[PDB]
Chain length 307, copies 6
């Protein structure tokens, strides 16, 4: 049996279920199954509960923000980040001040819910005491900020600004695994492998469009010659070119050719312009679930961390 | 109005089904949105403001917005026919309704089946006018000053607008009709010529913003083409079929004999190989065509008649083709 | 009277959301004009109008003729239809709403060494005085099941609150309830018995025979409905997989793909040329292949595709896969014959 | 039957959902009979102020079913529900027939306009040539039982019934039915849909009622005494609901002079007369009974007028406060219950 | 034939208003909760309409009575002589509309650069009343145009202040006005519609008596004593045990050695709620026990000048 | 650092609503600004809403001065800390008991007391008695006192009561109120299995009451208001009209009756009514307190002695001679 922890509430939870639904890995009850991965069982927990059960051995995998992983995991050696950047849950844990200064003789208050990571940053380049408090309004009320910043709007609303070097950590959602489970529970390691591969291929896919265009041409080679002259019509390896038939004088002839290329989403609009310039029409654009390519070093780095 | 601002602002409905359908349209365009102000990353430097629809029209006129998506009813009532508002796309194919006049089927309106015979009723004079309950304070007076009805007072009715004729608050109603079931439940009928306006959700733009603010026209162009290609796609199916044949050309002749297997320009035909007696040969060919969704079932039958099997059907985000006159007409309105 | 085809759908419950999700996955989205109102449209099918009802009301209205089609669990069809021959199951297994209506008895006590329905019947505790008490919501199917299996002294009741708690509270001796995973039964120290299953149930497409033979348009939209649901189930199902591969000709690449066990596709790989510029000349150095891959096979197929030099492997889902018609249509027409 | 089950508790069924539920819980709170909802998800709570009294929250239809089977002993339910689901069973005894909430009438409504414009009477509706065995009068209603009974009684033969989809009142406008049989309270739903009531169209007048099972009352230990207490408490609560206690300071020489003053006033009579007591205050360091306080019950509808009268005779500092119960002589209801029991 | 009184539909004003009527034993008979008309049956022909406060002012300007914030009355009422506030202080919804600035050493509005160009930008919801304060206070350089408290960070403010904590999260003379909930009536009904004047009279009397009561406690104590006058002297020796006019003193009997005698006396006084606790201490000091404390719906006393002031406004 | 008294109250659950209902009925109304609050009825008193566990902890840390919490939370999380003093141990809501439940079937059939669970031998150092519980601290302390050491405790996932049926645990340690959960899950209490009796309680910190000026007197005020209200909740005031010749005759009648005793005896005053144009005190009104549980029987008794028009009404407070809860608190404080 293989157990994977997922966030139970917050946007991290809805974004995680949205991620799984986009991978075609769909999951009142709190325990579910992902049937497309053999013997994989999902447990919905708060992220701190994912870290706690991963350390104890009740879970084998988890998806958690890097902030929760580093504070509640404490840099414990048992935890290994398999994928460090699932590209959601973007934030940074940092300190905010109003818009070395010697006023402290042990007799500087920072309000934070991160009871642990504040103290650690004081050994690196730091007289600091921590509290727990509307957290964002704490400097104005006199409680004491060290908090998560994403868009930074909360900082501007409370007349608070950010410092150079004030970012203690950059955080995304991450796929993490238990070391005791990967070495000791047979069957876990291969599904963490499959999970990493699927997440990489989905992230690449997310990503691209497949673009298919009708083009008038005499040969497949002339048409490909036209597509490859265009800078952003390169595709992964080049246009797939196939014949397109239509009835002329009661007889059929391949007057058109259909090309298919991958196009990055950010490049789509200008690509369309380019395709119109070389005579393409009826341009079908569609999304992808996965794009599998050559494996990234992430698997080998995981094995290097394991031995 | 005149504010140094790097970003193009697009107003979207904040509450109602227009909000949910608008966010649904953007998600179907793969235009994911990032409080009350968000960003659309895919369109360069495009920033979305969620507002009440009247506030979208008001802020477009005041200059706080550059584009908006709003129903044509909200646009015509609150814009009041101002020439600065240009509909860029007049038919986003959701929010369909019509603002019209409904009158009772009973009482004195039994044989009042046209707006004209509603007019010539000696019941209403300067003292006791024709009471019409509506939330459309501007458009009612306009519709009947355009059609010559002398003595009409308009009111906003307490609670259930449709029940006002039954309660005695008003003699008729001026309201939005979609399926018409609300009218039928209260013994109300429309009339010939009673339709004040036909409405859909529309992409609207400010003339002053497009002319004066850098980048507005290009992102309006991108949004219009994206909306047109997405509507075209929603639209069609991609249909891919395996067919046994000796050559690609024979297979193509077979699919083209069929009326609704034409596709956009014709079938794409490619070889399909399989192992026979340890040797492979292109015993099959796979064809690809676009099929309109309303033709899908019939197309499947036709594909079976010519030997097709394993017919894959899948949807499209966009279909980009030749640009519609909507762009050229917008530039015509701008000079 | 009327010229629209009416399709009944469950209004509340998990059956309702799963049904609307099935229709959206078919690109048959429902045009909820009023979300307070109970009637919507499916524009992709001509004159097809959806009515949101309680499932019992779907069966009642199919029998009365106010609906023509319905999607309902087989348990509800059996309990509220009572085997009326006018209700015909068109598609018997839409693969959601899986459960079984069965008998559960305590694990402990009097029922320790009772594990068959016959051994439940044999117990002597049950006479006209003091019968076997069964708590159930299935007012019709319980008595029929128990009169058919020779269990002679049984009284049935509806229970307050948690049906599964009725035997512990003393309200009842056994229950007749729906079992899916069976965890509710385990949580309440209950067990099924051999022969205790009254019926196996899924969501199903049902039609009125009077509507199909007598009302214009019903039989063809039932045909399209059956064909679309079957094709969608097949699609759910597969992935289309497209890979770039280096090769000199289409035949060499095809032989490489077919040498691999699970890269067979439905009929074999489609192989087309992929052109790329080398030294200012364009040439088909690569070829793109497309195959269907079953989803449970996806990962291994990827490995197989990498072994033969594949790259840039696009994976995407399908709304439909239409193939040869299943006998379900011919079976329907035979049921209509007379 | 649940008439044989051994249980120490006396069981009172209360409506689980609806306006009847909240109004019933309001009635209990106004009687200081607060229900200790042990679990809100659970359906059973306790009323600790009455010995061995346990409340079950049920559908009203389930309250009637359970009273007939003997699984409940008392219930509070509208008389419409009692007539529909009890069907006039002789075992159901109405102990209190008018709890003065849930007021409505089940009646027949037909369109104001159409063929029914001159139809104001019920047998005007009967002497109508439109309905035969071929095409009957369609009536939408949720009352599967009471409709047939009412119209077999009033000389109308050719009638069909439907449990209409959704908005019952909109059934005649949609063409689902030609009339409706429904509950009317203020009648605004009838006016909103251009429908009207009829002479003789009223099927029954209904309020919330305290009902009991006769087999339970005679056979189950403790039931009769707690229905006695409930009826008494309810009667008193209604009387209190009702009155104000009014207390006034008055300048006077003796209690009898003050009493003479209050009793000259028409609405200062009280239940039996003003209670009069001395009110002392320090003048120049000595206390003396310069004032007197009077206590009277005043009906709420008289309060304002009573105040004016109390000022005319020199009253001030008029304290007005409400009452939980007013117990007086028993009404005939209890004896009537015993006559129905034998 | 009908007298109509408007009440707020949503907000704390709504729950506080229905709580006010609920405390007055004028229960509101909401026959349809979805509908907007209810009745007060204890006052003959008194009908309640639930709507937003601007709508209440709108209909009083077009209703016979309304209960609305003084802010809504002054902004939407236009200072019209037809709207007469009969009771100006129902003691709920209390607040002040005032100006807050981030602007450090500026503490008076006069110190509040601002010209034709760059006119003092205040984001504010007071479409009518905003102009009034500065058109009257001599800053001619002001323009008016969400999540208001962050407006100084986002790009001074004129808003409602109650406890002021919302202001603290983000001046002298900045107060535009002080507001409470008020019972207002239209002159058109009072001079012209029969029965409006009389039910406004009853409403004003009930509201004044309830406000007095809200207010006090009735306190009843057992005290051992020989005579009523002795016990009364003991109660009156204590400063805040005076009551309205003095303690009501009555005999309390108990069985001693098989014979009954008035060994105790019960006193009744009104005690203000704010004074209750020390009143209990004082009552214990003079030998009281079993002190029953209970609330009041109304305390009617002599009419306030408000009715005669209203009639002076009516002539 | 801070200057005004802080009172912790439960934030969520029925404990929260029942607590706010009690305080509002005690005239300690909480003025919630928006979701920290204030109680203005006690001069200068400030409320903090927290999770029950947090209140105890914050009392221990110094951040709180008072709290209202169930005694189970107090004993489980306070760990018997001497800084926490219960001021009122029984606010008469949140009633429950923390106790041990075991199955009725199987091994445990003929086991109906704690000592018989002890003299059961299924449990060894290797395979101990598995008890599912949320009380990480309290449970072990209870069983070393009169049970075995062959006990392991666990936190059950999900439904604690279903843990013995699922095989997770052999017994549970849980809160019992009405006992329906245990009966629904075929579980049973044992004699001597009760670990603790719990109600909601008013708790205070010793450091705050002795050391922070103003804390002790506002706990005095809230303790007296809470005790007073509880006493009143409690009683009825009952007032009856009685025909009689003298007040003493009427008093003798009420006192001849067992349960009409009142607190000290009936108050008796004259009731006047018009006879022949003359007024005379033909009646007398008596006032007594009646415990609510006795009300109905007292009514019968009042009728037996000729009473009529019996007014019954409730009380907010009943203050008497000072309760020993204050004197005992001061004894625990060293005055
Ligand atoms: N041959 C095209 C499309 C494709 C990608 N993968 C398979 N086909 C490209 O390389 O971009
Ligand atoms: N060649 C097919 C499919 C296609 C459209 N666009 C690109 N390919 C058609 O013309 O319909
Ligand atoms: N011929 C490929 C792809 C395909 C399916 N259908 C049409 N083409 C296969 O059989 O998998
Ligand atoms: N004696 C007063 C007050 C009272 C009624 N009952 C007891 N006391 C009256 O008859 O109104
Ligand atoms: N006599 C007491 C109580 C009271 C007021 N009104 C009537 N009684 C007082 O003057 O305060
Ligand atoms: N004297 C009555 C009522 C009372 C109590 N306290 C004051 N009065 C009694 O002792 O019960």
């Amino acid at each position: 049996e293989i157990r994977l922890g997922l966030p139970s509430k917050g946007r991290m939870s809805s974004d995680t279920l949205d991620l799984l639904k986009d991978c075609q890995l769909s999951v009142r009850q709190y325990v579910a199954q992902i049937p497309q991965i053999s013997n994989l069982e999902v447990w919905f927990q708060r992220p701190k509960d994912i870290v706690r059960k991963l350390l104890s051995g009740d879970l084998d995998l988890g998806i958690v923000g890097l902030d929760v992983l580093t504070e509640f995991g404490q840099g414990n050696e048992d935890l290994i980040v398999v994928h460090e950047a699932l590209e959601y849950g973007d934030c940074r844990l940092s300190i905010a001040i109003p818009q070395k200064m010697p006023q402290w003789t042990e007799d500087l208050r920072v309000a934070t819910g991160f009871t642990y990571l504040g103290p650690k940053f004081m050994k690196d380049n730091g007289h600091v005491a921590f509290s727990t408090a509307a957290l964002e309004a704490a400097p104005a009320m006199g409680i004491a900020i060290l908090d998560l910043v994403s868009s930074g709007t909360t900082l501007k609303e409370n007349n608070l600004k950010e410092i150079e070097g004030g970012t203690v950590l950059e955080s995304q959602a991450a796929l993490v695994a238990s070391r005791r489970s990967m070495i000791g529970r047979k069957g876990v390691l291969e599904t963490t492998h499959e999970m990493l591969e699927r997440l990489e291929a989905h992230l690449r896919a997310m990503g691209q469009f497949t673009v298919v265009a009708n083009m008038r041409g005499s040969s497949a080679e002339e048409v490909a010659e036209r597509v490859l002259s265009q800078p952003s019509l390169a595709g992964l390896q080049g246009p797939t070119v196939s014949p397109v038939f239509c009835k002329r004088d009661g007889k059929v002839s391949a007057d058109y050719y259909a090309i298919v290329i991958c196009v990055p989403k950010k490049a789509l609009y200008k690509s369309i312009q380019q395709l119109r310039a070389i005579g393409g029409s009826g341009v079908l654009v569609s999304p992808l679930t996965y794009i599998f390519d050559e494996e990234t070093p992430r698997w080998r780095q995981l094995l290097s961390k394991l031995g």
